Amino acid sequence: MSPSAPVNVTVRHLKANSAVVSWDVLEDEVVIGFAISQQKKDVRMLRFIQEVNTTTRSCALWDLEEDTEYIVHVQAISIQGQSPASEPVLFKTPREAE
Amino acid sequence: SPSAPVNVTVRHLKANSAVVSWDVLEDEVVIGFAISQQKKDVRMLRFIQEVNTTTRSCALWDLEEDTEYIVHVQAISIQGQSPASEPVLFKTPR
């Protein structure tokens, strides 16, 4: 069996080249990690981050493109399995300062 | 068949961040990488990968100061994934 997809996935502290992703899970007692997928709306480069044996509920994304739209999906990892993708979170980075 | 990345090194070593770099023996078949990251005092296991990129480096952010970490790199190629580079142990300043 497996955990439920992550809920309330939000994007905070969104900067020109970085952002932080947060979420919640329904079963905190079963979730040991997470897997995140990142790709630009204009897909090309695909970035994947996974962390296990942690209690974290946020993951930073660095070296993002300025004035660019991204699509991130979060998944929850259990000791027995993994959950389906959360709902896609979409966002766009601010412009580079001049 | 894809060869393990070599010359894996840590640069711009800072209290909370660093950059890992490597070279590969077959630039032509390589399209990405997989980096494994953990503390020497194992707890949280972090795994990163990028596909369809020509980069030869990856920044590691939000590291704890005065802490030892162990990382290794794997090449992602059009002929599968390489075995892992030799592990690299480094310590963040204070």
| Residue B52 forms contact with A (CB below 8 Å) | yes
Its domain, for residue A96, covers 2-98
Q: In CATH, what number is assigned to the domain containing residue A86?
A: 2.60.40.10
Cβ separation A53–B46 shorter than 8 A: no
Distance CA B33, CA B47 (A): 11
Q: DSSP state, B87? A: P
This entry's atomic model was obtained through X-ray
Residue positions counted in chain A: 98
Chain breaks in chain A (C to N over 2.5 A) after: none
Distance CA B24, CA B65 (A): 30
Q: DSSP state, A13? A: S
Distance CA B85, CA A33 (A): 25
Residue B43: phi, psi to the nearest 5?
Answer: -150, -90
Of the residues A15, A53, A75, A79, the best mutation for testing chain B's interface (the one with the most B CB atoms within 10 Å of its CB) is: A53
Distance CA A85, CA A87 (A): 6
Do B10 and B57 form a contact (C-beta atoms < 8 A)?
no
Closest CA to B59 of A82, A34, A17: A17
Residue A81: phi, psi to the nearest 5?
Answer: -165, -150
Considering its fold, how many domains does chain A have in total? 1
The reported resolution of this PDB entry, expressed in Å, is 2.3
